[PDB]
């Protein structure tokens, strides 16, 4: 009965490199983290100034 518990679909929120159920997410692992960290790196570079 706890085997009726499927995780609700998220395609509606997923980053595009991650939409495919047949694609390993390790490929976009670097790219995805890179981006968000670049975002904060720049940010902090901005506060720094």
């Amino acid at each position: 009965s706890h085997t009726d518990i499927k995780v609700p679909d998220f395609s509606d929120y997923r980053r595009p490199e991650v939409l495919d159920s047949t694609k390993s997410s390790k490929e976009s692992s670097e790219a995805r983290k890179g981006f968000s960290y670049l975002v904060t790196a720049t940010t902090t570079v901005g506060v720094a100034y």
């Binding site: 670097e30 790219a31 983290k33 890179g34 981006f35 960290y37 670049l38 790196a41 902090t44 570079v45 720094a48 100034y49």
Partner: protein
């Protein structure tokens, strides 16, 4: 050929060392280039400065 962001993560963002090193190295060059472009933008939209006024008084 991976991605710019990917290659960027591996070589500099992964370790908090290089991550931080990158931003202190990246802040130095940013302060310089942003101050250039900025002041330039500030002058270009002006020109009643004391810059273009000097040409007249090199003497005394």
């Amino acid at each position: 050929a991976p991605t710019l962001t990917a290659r960027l993560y591996s070589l500099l963002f992964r370790r908090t060392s290089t991550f931080a090193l990158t931003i202190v190295v990246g802040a130095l060059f940013f302060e310089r280039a942003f101050d250039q472009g900025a002041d330039a933008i500030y002058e270009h939209i002006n020109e009643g400065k004391l810059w273009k006024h000097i040409k007249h008084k090199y003497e005394n």
